[PDB]
Each structure stands twice: as C-alpha cells, then as structure tokens.
C-alpha cells in the first residue's frame, strides 16, 4: 500500500488495544527498522504486505522489500537530530550532540535522549536530512536513563 518516503509507526493489535512497538524509515521502496521491533515478522501497509528481505540480530537491523538503502554517516563533529516518534505522540525533532560508544572493534556515535522502548527505529538525521542511523539499541546508565547508539546499516 503506502510506500511514500517518510517516518512510520510500527503497531500491533496483539496486545491490549493498538500498541506501538517501534518506528521505521521508508526510502526507495524499502522499509528500515530495528530487528527487536518486528523479530523479522511480516508487516502490513493497508491492504499490502511487506516481507523481510535482509536482517541481522547483532547489528539489530532489518529491511523490507529490498536491501538496506541508508548509508549516510555521522561526521563525528556536528550536532544531529533525533526525529522521535513516541507512542501516541506527534513526531518531533530533537537536536543533540552525540557522545561516543568505545568498543573493541571501533567507536560508534551515541545519542543521550530518554524515550519509551516503543520509540525504537526513529531516525537520526544530519543537517541535510539524511538518515545517519536509527535510535533504539544502547545501554542503561547509572540513574536508569537510556543512551542509544547511532545504528547504521550497510548499503551493498
């Protein structure tokens, strides 16, 4: 059905009422979201169906209808915007300067903004509006707040 570019909510009628389990990006006919949102399950878009095409539990990413299309990267210097789409609430741009996740295999950008788990898959943008990653996979620091990585896939 709806394949127009944009940010979308991922809903389920399985639990009580309609519950938002996550968010995703539609770009070039491909829906991009985090693996933990759908678990690789099929998705519905009105009367149409979206079938998983690529996915990886370790990266925590999944694409529907085609290969991962998003390949912009954080420059390691500039402020970014989390286009947060929280459950039952309007989409809203939040500007922040990312921190750093230091790993044994290199450093990753990290946005320190606290949002409900159902906000997972919300895009992080550069000043050009290009998607540099998705919010939803990170860690819980000492006080209980969430610090998420700027998770990006690979455009083959």
């Amino acid at each position: 059905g709806e394949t127009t570019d944009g940010v979308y909510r991922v809903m389920t009628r399985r639990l009580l009422g309609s519950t938002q389990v996550g968010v995703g990006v539609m770009q070039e006919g491909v829906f991009h979201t985090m693996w933990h949102v759908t678990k690789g399950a099929a998705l519905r878009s009105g009367e149409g169906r979206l079938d998983p095409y690529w996915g990886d539990v370790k990266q925590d990413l999944v694409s529907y209808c085609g290969p991962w299309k998003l390949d912009a990267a954080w420059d390691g210097l500039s402020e970014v915007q989390l286009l947060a789409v929280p459950p039952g609430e309007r989409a809203k741009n939040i500007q922040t300067l990312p921190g750093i996740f230091k790993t044994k295999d290199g450093d990753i950008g990290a946005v320190a903004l606290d949002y409900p788990a159902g906000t997972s898959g919300s895009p992080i943008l550069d000043k050009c509006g290009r998607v540099i990653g998705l919010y939803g996979n990170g860690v819980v620091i000492k006080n209980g707040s969430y610090v998420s990585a700027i998770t990006q896939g690979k455009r083959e």
């Binding site: 709806e2 979308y8 759908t38 741009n93 996740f101 990290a110 903004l113 860690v139």
Partner: protein, 39 residues
C-alpha cells in the same frame, strides 16, 4: 500481525529543541545484539 502508519517527513528542523549530553562510554556488544557497560 503488525502494521505501519505514516508519522511524517524526514527533514532537519531549524530551531528544534536542543537537549541531551555527549557521554563517552566503554561498551561491549554481544552476539544477541545487546550492549553492556564495561567499567
């Protein structure tokens, strides 16, 4: 069954609410895609 609903356009917003800090954390990524703090 899961379904998608449009929520908006992907554009940078000039004069958006600026918040959040920039922390440097030593983390570890496991095979299940879960990050954990290494201190």
């Amino acid at each position: 069954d899961m379904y998608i609903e449009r929520a908006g356009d992907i554009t940078w917003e000039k004069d958006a609410e600026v918040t959040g800090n920039s922390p440097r954390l030593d983390v570890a990524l496991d095979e299940s895609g879960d990050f954990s703090l290494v201190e």
